[PDB]
Design a binder for this molecule. Structure first.
Ligand SMILES: [Zn+2]
Ligand SMILES: [Zn+2]
Ligand SMILES: [Zn+2]
Lengths: 401, 130
RNA sequence: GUAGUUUGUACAGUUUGAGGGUCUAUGAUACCACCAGGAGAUAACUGUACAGGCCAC
């Protein structure tokens, strides 16, 4: 009797979880695998599921994180080594404010080249570059302002051809088929890409938000630089290939600082708005950045919200880096929530009605759609979690010369 | 085919080095009385795989003349069948049974019986009777 | 809330590559013996869903 129960518990050791009373549609199944998130018919199905090939991927995939999770916390020498590594990443080839001077002048050169024959237009630096929330080899986000007596896809015809006859740059992709039609360029001084978008005001507002946070908090730049670089080496930052957007990585690390108690950034909505309700959070729509320490808001009444605290970081950067990797490898349950840095408590998928079997992330000035829908394949999802696993494996591992 | 056939019974057979001896009841289709000794070797054996005989099973063969007992050119079982080998596609991990596998043996699962002491505690490869 | 349209992915049976210390090796009496604790690895047909996803309501 009970020996058969202990042997089906030996099946449960390989992640088969039984039920006794079930939903009428779930009457078909006595078991479930929480790794595969798929209901399982019976004890024979459990015997099947211990052989089942996705579960074998799921078993090893789940067992992998326990190693890195057990890998040791940094010693003071290890802390110094981690800090030295991330600052030399940030400085030697990462885009600091000093390198941002070069990238801003590159954006100015793009403006010069394009507005040589589109003088009414104007090109605006924004995105991960301008924030200093950057990476070593990066693409500058450039935004065309244009008079609205013309169509921006039509205007991109007048944008592309100069670059298609340019003498300064390489990598001129005719990237009209992107969701925002752009023309791409590679500056050859920095050796790095450039992307010429237009009219993306909400991205520029989030850019000013993150730049204000970096003005308040220094670690901001170094930490995200590091994270982005890592994701790139790990090819997670390519949103077209089932990955996560870099903008979304920036908001991800902002959420990390927003939740790593004591949180080194302050949240945008709360009790200082007297009579605020998080259950009608959408009504409290934010507006433009004020003084690079505040963000505005307005509804149909309006005001501003603080982006600062009374003291900056006084904790070692390597500790911040290791716990930043620990946050989005082991702490933030990627599939259960939206990365929602509008609110201290995490906003769920069904709170914005989005599906669940991937990460969800929101734009700060547009909570309309998930900007993390690119993960859909569970194989690519397991690959991304495996890259995060390799991150928290190596960077928790001590070294030898 | 040859005229040099024969038949009889196995005297003995080593599996590992692959030779033995036979005692023959027939020679070239002619019956014999008393039986004669005739060799068997794995280079002479017709079977595939690890060619071996049960040490006493019935056989058929072909021969040629030899001093240390007759030498076989070919050896088979009776009627040309494959020889057995010394008589002593895997054990079902639900029950230990060779004849079935996982979905072939869908009975409710069992804990680890140590086969050396016949108790459900551990594994026979860790039991010190080895 | 329920469909017609196929994908990887579990898939259920079939057909399956190894049958798994497989491998092995002394030409005239020595083999067998003596270390397993692990739900058994791909391509094809077929039965359903996951969820990506086509045409609708
Ligand atoms: Zn499973
Ligand atoms: Zn069996
Ligand atoms: Zn024992």
């Amino acid at each position: 009797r009970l020996g058969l129960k202990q042997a089906e518990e030996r099946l449960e050791r390989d992640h088969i979880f039984r039920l006794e009373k079930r939903s009428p549609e779930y009457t078909n199944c006595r078991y479930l695998c929480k790794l595969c998130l798929i209901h399982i018919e019976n004890i024979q199905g459990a015997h099947k599921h211990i052989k089942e090939k996705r579960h074998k991927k799921n078993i090893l995939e789940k067992q992998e994180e326990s190693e890195l999770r057990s890998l040791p916390p940094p010693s003071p020498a290890h802390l110094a080594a981690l800090s030295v590594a991330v600052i030399e990443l940030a400085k030697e080839h990462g885009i600091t404010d000093d390198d941002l001077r070069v990238r801003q002048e590159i954006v100015e050169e793009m403006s010069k080249v394009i507005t040589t024959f589109l003088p009414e237009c104007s090109l605006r630096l924004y995105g991960s570059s301008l924030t200093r929330f950057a990476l070593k080899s990066s693409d500058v986000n450039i935004d065309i302002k244009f008079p609205p007596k013309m169509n921006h896809p039509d205007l991109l015809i007048k944008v592309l051809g100069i670059l298609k006859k340019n003498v300064l740059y390489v990598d001129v992709e005719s990237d009209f088929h992107a969701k925002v039609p752009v023309v791409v360029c590679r500056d050859r001084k920095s050796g790095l890409l450039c992307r010429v978008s237009a009219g993306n005001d909400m991205a520029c507002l989030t850019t000013d938000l993150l730049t204000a946070l970096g003005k308040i908090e220094p670690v901001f730049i170094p930490l995200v630089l590091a994270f982005r670089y890592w994701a790139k080496l790990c090819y997670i930052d390519s949103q077209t290939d089932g990955g996560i957007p870099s903008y979304c990585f920036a908001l991800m690390v902002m959420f990390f600082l927003q939740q790593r108690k004591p949180p080194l950034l302050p949240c945008l909505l709360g009790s200082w708005i007297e009579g605020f309700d998080p259950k009608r959070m959408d009504d409290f729509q934010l507006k433009g950045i004020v003084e690079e320490k505040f963000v505005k808001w307005e509804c149909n009444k309006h005001g501003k919200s603080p982006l600062a605290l009374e003291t900056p970081n006084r904790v070692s950067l390597g500790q911040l880096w290791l716990e930043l990797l620990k946050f989005y490898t082991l702490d933030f349950a990627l599939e259960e929530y939206v990365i929602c840095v509008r609110i201290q408590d995490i906003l769920t998928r069904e709170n914005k009605n989005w599906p669940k079997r991937r990460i969800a992330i929101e734009d700060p000035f547009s909570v309309k759609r998930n900007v993390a829908r690119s993960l859909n394949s569970q194989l690519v999802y397991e690959y991304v979690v495996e890259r995060f696993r390799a991150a928290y494996r190596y960077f928790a591992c001590p070294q030898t010369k | 085919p040859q005229l040099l056939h024969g038949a009889g019974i196995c005297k003995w057979f080593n599996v590992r080095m692959g030779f033995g001896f036979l005692s023959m009841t027939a020679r070239a289709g002619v019956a014999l009385d008393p039986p004669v000794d005739v060799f068997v070797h794995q280079s002479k054996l017709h079977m595939e795989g690890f060619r071996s005989l049960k040490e006493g099973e019935a056989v058929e063969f072909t021969f040629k003349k030899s001093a240390k007992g007759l030498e076989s050119i070919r050896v088979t079982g009776p009627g040309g069948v494959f020889c057995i080998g010394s008589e002593r596609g895997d054990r079902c991990y639900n029950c230990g049974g060779l004849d079935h596998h996982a979905k072939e043996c869908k009975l409710p699962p069992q804990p680890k019986k140590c086969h050396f002491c016949q108790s459900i505690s551990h594994m026979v490869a860790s039991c010190p009777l080895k």
